[PDB]
Amino acid sequence: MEAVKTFNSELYSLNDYKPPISKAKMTQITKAAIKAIKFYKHVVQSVEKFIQKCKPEYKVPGLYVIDSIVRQSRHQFGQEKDVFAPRFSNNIISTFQNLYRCPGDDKSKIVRVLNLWQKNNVFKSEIIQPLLDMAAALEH
């Protein structure tokens, strides 16, 4: 799958940069995801695999990838037609378990994204609440 390989290249290329990741790079990754929309399941799988396996400093960049793809898809295809948020929702507990293996000072960045997803109805509130609870439990 050409489009999936192109996306994989953009995503893995995060490893060639020191975080914080630039807007330009995030845009590149996002554009590749959207071009690969026929294979959205493979795109989600690749992002989840990156988050599972990447160095701790890339956890938050990985989350930003999810954020950017989902928000761009909702914009470009419509909030109700977006295939990405529903697909990312499937393994989201797993994803966040992996995300919270970030450095201590990056935990607040994860919660910031969760709060924005809730405020902006990016994901269903039922999905988000356990992810926030996981953040808080880590502080106790």
Partner: peptide
């Protein structure tokens, strides 16, 4: 400029 989740699409 670096990516922010508060920035528009």
């Amino acid at each position: 400029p670096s990516y922010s989740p508060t920035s528009p699409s």
